[PDB]
Design a protein around this ligand. Structure first.
Ligand SMILES: *[C@@H]1O[C@H](CO)[C@@H](O[C@@H]2O[C@H](CO)[C@@H](O)[C@H](O)[C@H]2NC(C)=O)[C@H](O)[C@H]1NC(C)=O
Ligand SMILES: *[C@@H]1O[C@H](CO)[C@@H](O[C@@H]2O[C@H](CO)[C@@H](O)[C@H](O)[C@H]2NC(C)=O)[C@H](O)[C@H]1NC(C)=O
Ligand SMILES: *[C@@H]1O[C@H](CO)[C@@H](O[C@@H]2O[C@H](CO)[C@@H](O)[C@H](O)[C@H]2NC(C)=O)[C@H](O)[C@H]1NC(C)=O
Ligand SMILES: *[C@@H]1O[C@H](CO)[C@@H](O[C@@H]2O[C@H](CO)[C@@H](O)[C@H](O)[C@H]2NC(C)=O)[C@H](O)[C@H]1NC(C)=O
Ligand SMILES: *[C@@H]1O[C@H](CO)[C@@H](O[C@@H]2O[C@H](CO)[C@@H](O)[C@H](O)[C@H]2NC(C)=O)[C@H](O)[C@H]1NC(C)=O
Ligand code: NAG
Ligand code: NAG
Ligand code: NAG
Ligand code: NAG
Ligand code: NAG
Ligand code: NAG
Ligand code: NAG
Ligand code: NAG
Ligand code: NAG
Lengths: 427, 231, 392, 147, 49
């Protein structure tokens, strides 16, 4: 029907993909921590810090034999694309009935007294059993059994004191109600699965905020300069146009933020250039029409857009040619509400028919076109005022007019239970 | 003994460009109108605790105060941290040093005992903030020239960062070392940072021009919960 | 203050002088017309969130319909107050109005605007300076400063739509209403404008409140000077820093606060791992990213729904206020009213309209009695065995 | 059109509420009889609770907008009762309250869900120019007209 | 009656707000002290949510 309609975004658009990264020196020490025969035991574990690596994660979850590979804040397939700011590695060997305790918030003596992952853990836990090197009864592996209180996350404490429970001072000498914590493992090939020794590596990183040092094995691409892409700068991803910025950063700052915690500018990690980030859909479109029983002509208004950047705003070069007719042409008119394309501007003034905004209206009027004009407020007039002149009326009319007022509305009723859970008892 | 720090110690909390906003942050700051201890080595150097951070500022004339040691036991059992400079490059050793009871300068003191890693790189005011969560070690700084009689100015000074070191040491004490020409083997302002909630004001170029802390008086809470500077 | 009336049963008080009083009344008429792109707010530019928002049905269609109804109601609100007359009257060049001086409320042709002096004062006392989103959306007028600023692609889907009538058009409407009332009286509201000299019209209006019309002709210069002084007091009060348009500033404050809350709700995570939707997609596979994206979708939908419901409840009150302003334009400016305290304080003589930002100001001219005296009174008089009662 | 828009809005709201029963809100289907013929009660409960949450929200939105619309119909009926008392049972002096002109009388008629008023007014016509004066001096005394 | 209806309508709404605290909304209980003493905070968080 006749009027003006805001229309949601149905225009198709193809995109490409970009990847940028810093220049990181050498391949990562993962030959050390997975091949080292000299592992530790859980009561004293070893933290190895990893920085400035190009680590290919995909040759270890695929090209290896591992029993359980559980990543917690990340996915395993996405690990090649990210950058991790600090990576730690932790290695020990324990029994495989308690490999379920290398997990957030778990309980048990290995989880209460040896190793405590925090509840907001981000990283992976990798396990695969041993029956050659961590067995024979091999007696090289301890685990604590007694403690006054529980451990805090990412803490380790070696103290070979003796643990008292009852009413006896046990300082240096053992006795009743008094025990020695570090009692060892028995690992034998005279057993089945459940008491066998298992190796476990725990990687923990932080994806939040720094300059990036550990990255993945991905190689860079070009910068395609005012086109919608799927960009990737240091691991922070997005979608949109890449505008050339002129902002004034500081030497330490790496990207920008507006109010809503979104990213609106970024620093390229190779060429050190600041470039602006802007969305791309343009769903600010309105369509003026008369009735569809009248014509199939329309006009299009582009909201608060100047009339020369209408092809660049809506990405006119990638639309159908039946859309690109409305991006430019003969009928182009700039209003204070936006750019009006498809209706020609005349110089008379009429009453308003279809309101466009800010004093402009549109009508279907004599071939039949669509015209745009400044609306008129009424007829100009002037009273004949002087200080001794009056007007008196000599006749009259009798007028009858009509006023319509709504009084009531329809009385409806909704059975909640039949709407929500209709004729069912489990609901 | 005791003096005031008016609006003094404000540092950048991240590396994010913000322009023309009023951000609200929560970190370890030096609270406003606090009592800082002002030292002078006349007769000295005591040892001072390291609770959550130390706001350090000093009054320099001829390159007197050089560096600090960050110790915990000081009997070569537990590691410590030595940060000095000799006008050629700042040098940072994390060794288990030959800690005597008074350092000095040969106007050269550098031992090699199981070091983890090394780093090599009243006219002027040089203020510093040292905070040490176990995992990093952040140092902030700002240079500005002052021309007042004794004390700190009331202007606003954002303290940009310089280095961050992956360390992981409990630091329970710390001790400075200033310029001595004597060579013996005898057998500046300090304030401590607390968890407060601050309201920072960014303008264009990304500069914090003034801040509101919340816990100072009721008018401070009015300004913070209105997210405004005017009431 | 306490007071005691000297009530006797044969005592009366009669006024011996009077006062012409001019007071001010401010009413809100419309508000800001906003529109939200529901998909750009919730899922902005992500084509994986868009296919999961289609599982919630027609919530975005239903929100856009309610906001479009509010934004059309705002233009109808202005049309019912200011477009009362369909003739655009002008006032004649010689201003021989019997001593009365309408200079500060009639339009000044010097300035670019069609505004008067008092309307110019009113258009500076309502400010948008401490009004976060609306002021900085209005700062997408950098005029050259960036070549490609599409300021509809910068605020996460939230925009501001312009009014249908501009400010010059509302000033033209109030110009025509003022010229009609000054040159013809109450006749142009019932038919065609029939001219009458201004002191005769003031004599009619003195008859309307129970004073005989010789009182005006005998005190004409005093009445004209008192009017010219009260208009100067209005103008000198508004040119001060005593900010008197508080009822109009409160509407802008409530609207700006409601939009700032909606922009700030885009940093809550509502239980997800992150509030940034581009970090959930670059760190998780789709069957697990589905779980966090549904949490963000549900929370952001609730934020939008709360915004729209409170906008409907605010728009109902602006509509009631605009209906009151239209009744006051019909009954105070187009006629003389007998309803007590409806058009001022005192016995009503006449009213004049002025346009304000999103509002209207009425200047009510009333008659106030002054300087009373004591007399003895009687209900009737006996002359010839007959009771006599006074005619009026 | 004022009477037709009330009927149109109420029908549109009921049609939106019926169409919202085909959304799944993240479940495996929108049909409650197909979750309860493919799943056992520990697992079916997780999908039924998602459907319950979405349908409660749809009903709550419907009822809130019905309350807001009923407040407006109430305010319109109060104005219609004031016009029945003041224009049909009396003769009003309020300008433009009972038509355009000077009010003589009104007549009501009944409409579906509403009322129609027929206002009879006096409109002056065919004016003429004269000269006028505020008073007349005869024997050194000013004379004014009574009405 | 018109002055009584306002007091009645307000008292009902406050009673309904207070009685909505004995609902569990699909959790295991409606007491926060009995969710913590019967689960571990990996999955004692999603009942409180
Ligand atoms: C007042 O107006 C009425 C019409 O509203 C005039 O009546 C008409 O007069 C003409 C002239 O002879 C007739 O042809 C029409 O038939 C009359 N109309 C009606 C409805 O009767 C009337 O003459 C006017 N009076 C004056 C004094 O001008
Ligand atoms: C960091 O150092 C402090 C001080 O050296 C440690 O706290 C004390 O450590 C000694 C060890 O000789 C204990 O005897 C004390 O009882 C500790 N003080 C207490 C518990 O209040 C602190 O434990 C060290 N931190 C770490 C993680 O090793
Ligand atoms: C009624 O009040 C007016 C004041 O509003 C009186 O006019 C004043 O008259 C005195 C002396 O004649 C002057 O000094 C004042 O300046 C006048 N005021 C104004 C505003 O002109 C008037 O005299 C009073 N009438 C009576 C009968 O007392
Ligand atoms: C009507 O009032 C206005 C406002 O007071 C008068 O205009 C001012 O008159 C003074 C003195 O004559 C001048 O100095 C100003 O320049 C005038 N203009 C302003 C303030 O804009 C005006 O003269 C009065 N009209 C008559 C006929 O007296
Ligand atoms: C009308 O007469 C009464 C009666 O005297 C006045 O009322 C008192 O007047 C005296 C002085 O004349 C005052 O001290 C009292 O305060 C008045 N009030 C009362 C309650 O006694 C009254 O003032 C006279 N009216 C005028 C205008 O003077
Ligand atoms: C080290 O481990 C890898 C599997 O991660 C294996 O391919 C390789 O042969 C091992 N090397 C030795 C010396 O065991
Ligand atoms: C990374 O290497 C490229 C060579 O392809 C060079 O152009 C760029 O400047 C380098 N970036 C650095 C060293 O930061
Ligand atoms: C569209 O339909 C209406 C309804 O009958 C009709 O009056 C009108 O003439 C039609 N439009 C045209 C262009 O014929
Ligand atoms: C639109 O852009 C052109 C080119 O810069 C400029 O000349 C014109 O002024 C702009 N339109 C408006 C309304 O400013
Ligand atoms: C409108 O007026 C302008 C200037 O008066 C003129 O250049 C233009 O051609 C006119 N257009 C139409 C359609 O009348
Ligand atoms: C700081 O010192 C002053 C003396 O100058 C003292 O009054 C005050 O109590 C001290 N403590 C504060 C401000 O916490
Ligand atoms: C280096 O570490 C070993 C291991 O404990 C220690 O015995 C040795 O004393 C350290 N060397 C120092 C402190 O110079
Ligand atoms: C921001 O930068 C500009 C350009 O260097 C400079 O003129 C302006 O003074 C700066 N702002 C402030 C507050 O110093
Ligand atoms: C009254 O006189 C004025 C002055 O010429 C004129 O414009 C107007 O038309 C006259 N009115 C009538 C009804 O003739």
């Amino acid at each position: 029907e006749k009027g003006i309609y805001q229309t949601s975004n149905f225009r198709v658009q193809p995109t490409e993909s970009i990847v940028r990264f810093p220049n990181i020196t050498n391949l990562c020490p993962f030959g050390e921590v997975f091949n080292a025969t000299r592992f530790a035991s859980v009561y004293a574990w070893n933290r190895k810090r990893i920085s400035n690596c190009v680590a290919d994660y995909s040759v270890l979850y695929n090209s290896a034999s591992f029993s359980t590979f559980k990543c917690y804040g990340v996915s395993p397939t996405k690990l090649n694309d990210l950058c991790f700011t600090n990576v730690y590695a932790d290695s020990f060997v324990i029994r495989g009935d308690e490999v379920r305790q290398i997990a957030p918030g778990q309980t048990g003596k290995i989880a209460d007294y040896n190793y405590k992952l925090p509840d907001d853990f981000t990283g992976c836990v990798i396990a695969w059993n041993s029956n050659n090197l961590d067995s024979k009864g091999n007696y090289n592996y301890l685990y604590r059994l007694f403690r006054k209180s529980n451990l805090k996350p990412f803490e380790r404490d070696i103290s070979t004191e003796i643990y008292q429970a009852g009413s006896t001072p046990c300082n240096g000498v053992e006795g009743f109600n008094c025990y020695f914590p570090l009692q060892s493992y028995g690992f034998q090939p005279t057993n089945g699965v459940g008491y066998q020794p298992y190796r476990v590596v725990v990687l923990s990183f932080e994806l939040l905020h720094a300059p990036a040092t550990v990255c993945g094995p991905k190689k860079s691409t070009n910068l395609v300069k005012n086109k919608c892409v799927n960009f990737n700068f240091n691991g922070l991803t997005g979608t949109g146009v890449l505008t050339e910025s002129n902002k004034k950063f500081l030497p330490f700052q790496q990207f920008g933020r507006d109010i809503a915690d979104t990213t609106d500018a970024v620093r390229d990690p190779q060429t050190l250039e600041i470039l602006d980030i802007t969305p791309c859909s343009f769903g600010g479109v309105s369509v003026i029409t008369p009735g569809t029983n009248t014509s199939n002509q329309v006009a299009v208004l582009y909201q608060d857009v100047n009339c020369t950047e209408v092809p660049v705003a809506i990405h006119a070069d990638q639309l159908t040619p039946t859309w690109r007719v409305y991006s430019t042409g003969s009928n182009v008119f700039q209003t204070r509400a936006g750019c009006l394309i498809g209706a020609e501007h005349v110089n008379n003034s009429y009453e308003c028919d279809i309101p466009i905004g800010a004093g402009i209206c549109a009508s279907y009027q004599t071939s039949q076109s669509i015209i745009a004009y400044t609306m008129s407020l009424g007829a100009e007039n002037s009273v004949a005022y002087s200080n001794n002149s009056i007007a008196i009326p000599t006749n009259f009319t009798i007028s009858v007019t009509t006023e319509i007022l709504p009084v009531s509305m329809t009385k409806t009723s909704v059975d909640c239970t039949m709407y929500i859970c209709g004729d069912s008892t489990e609901c | 003994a005791y003096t005031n720090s008016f609006t003094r110690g404000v540092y950048y909390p991240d590396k994010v460009f913000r322009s023309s906003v009023l951000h609200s942050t929560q970190d370890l700051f030096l609270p406003f109108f606090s009592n800082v201890t002002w030292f002078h080595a006349i007769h000295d150097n005591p040892v001072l605790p390291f609770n959550d951070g130390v706001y350090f500022a000093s009054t320099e004339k001829s390159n007197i105060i050089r560096g600090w040691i960050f110790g915990t036991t000081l009997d070569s059992k537990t590691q410590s941290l030595l940060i000095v400079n000799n006008a050629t490059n700042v040098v940072i050793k994390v060794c288990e040093f030959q800690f005597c009871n008074d350092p000095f300068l040969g106007v050269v003191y550098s031992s090699a005992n199981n070091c983890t890693f090394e780093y090599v790189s009243f006219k002027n005011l040089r203020e510093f903030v040292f905070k040490n969560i176990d995992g990093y070690f952040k140092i902030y700084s700002k240079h500005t020239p002052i021309n007042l009689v004794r004390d700190l100015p009331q202007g606003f000074s954002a303290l940009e960062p310089l280095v961050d070191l992956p360390i992981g040491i409990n630091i329970t004490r710390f001790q400075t070392l200033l310029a001595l020409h004597r060579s013996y083997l005898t057998p500046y302002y300090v304030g401590y940072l607390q968890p407060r909630t601050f309201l920072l004001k960014y303008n264009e170029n990304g500069t914090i021009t003034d801040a509101v802390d919340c816990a100072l008086d009721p008018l401070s809470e009015t300004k913070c919960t209105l997210k405004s500077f005017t009431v | 203050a306490e007071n005691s009336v000297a009530y006797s049963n044969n005592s009366i008080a009669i006024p011996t002088n009077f006062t012409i009083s001019v007071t001010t009344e401010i009413l809100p008429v419309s508000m800001t017309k906003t529109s939200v792109d529901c998909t750009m707010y919730i899922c902005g530019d992500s084509t994986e969130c868009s296919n999961l928002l289609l599982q919630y049905g027609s919530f975005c269609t239903q929100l856009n319909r309610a906001l479009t109804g509010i934004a059309v109601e705002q233009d109808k609100n202005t049309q019912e107050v200011f477009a009362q007359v369909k003739q655009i009257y002008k006032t004649p060049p010689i201003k021989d109005f019997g001593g009365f001086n309408f200079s500060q409320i009639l339009p000044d042709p010097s300035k670019p605007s069609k505004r008067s002096f008092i309307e110019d004062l009113l258009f500076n006392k309502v400010t948008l300076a401490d009004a976060g989103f609306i002021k900085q959306y209005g700062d997408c007028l950098g005029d050259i400063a960036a070549r490609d600023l599409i300021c509809a692609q910068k605020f996460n889907g939230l925009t501001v739509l312009p009014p249908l009538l501009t400010d010059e058009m509302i000033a033209q409407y109030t110009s025509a209403l003022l010229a009609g009332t000054i040159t013809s009286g109450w006749t142009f509201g019932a038919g065609a404008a029939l001219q009458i000299p201004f002191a005769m019209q003031m004599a009619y209006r003195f008859n309307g409140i129970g004073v005989t019309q010789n009182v005006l002709y005998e005190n004409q210069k005093l009445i004209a000077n008192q009017f010219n002084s009260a208009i100067g007091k209005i103008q000198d009060s508004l040119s001060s820093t005593a900010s008197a348009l508080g009822k109009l500033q409160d509407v802008v404050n409530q609207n700006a606060q409601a939009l700032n809350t909606l922009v700030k709700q885009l940093s809550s995570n509502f239980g997800a791992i992150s509030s940034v939707l581009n970090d959930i997609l670059s760190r998780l596979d789709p069957p697990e990213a589905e779980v966090q994206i549904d949490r963000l979708i549900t929370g952001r939908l609730q934020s939008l729904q709360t915004y729209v419901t409170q906008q409907l409840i605010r728009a109902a009150e602006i509509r009631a206020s605009a209906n009151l302003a239209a009744t006051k334009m019909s009954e105070c400016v187009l006629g003389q009213s007998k309803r007590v305290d409806f058009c001022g304080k005192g016995y009503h003589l006449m009213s004049f309209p002025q346009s304000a930002p999103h509002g209207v100001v009425f200047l009510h001219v009333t008659y106030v009695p002054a300087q009373e005296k004591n007399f003895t009174t009687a209900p009737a008089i006996c002359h010839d065995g007959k009771a006599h009662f006074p005619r009026e």
